Amino acid sequence: LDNMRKAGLTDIPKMIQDWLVDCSIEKFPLMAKIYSWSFHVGFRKQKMLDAALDQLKTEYTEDVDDEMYREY
């Protein structure tokens, strides 16, 4: 939420904040409504390269177990 406010968001942290006073399930569909308001903003159509590098960062190490991988 600190990142959320740091981005420039004011009303929707408050709507997320007043629910925690009760943590009730009757007021909870707002959250669900909110969870759907995030995906109707569009796609993040960036480049093939930078989109691959979301995956193509690797940290392969000779410090993992061997007891685990053999069982795996």
């Binding site: 690797t58 392969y60 000779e62 991988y69 053999r70």
Partner: protein
């Protein structure tokens, strides 16, 4: 990209029809353990022939 190298043992198998029976041993040289060898020899009082 420096991959690891993960090497299981893999336990190489066969099946029964593919078991080769045996190959007989015919003999090579006669399995010596000892052999002769020339050495000098020294008569009593220690000196040499």
């Amino acid at each position: 990209k420096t991959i690891p190298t993960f090497e299981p043992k893999e336990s190489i198998l066969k099946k029964l029809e593919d078991i080769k029976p045996e190959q007989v041993k015919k003999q090579t040289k006669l399995f010596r353990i000892f052999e002769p060898r020339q050495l000098p020899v020294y008569r009593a009082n220690g000196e040499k022939e």
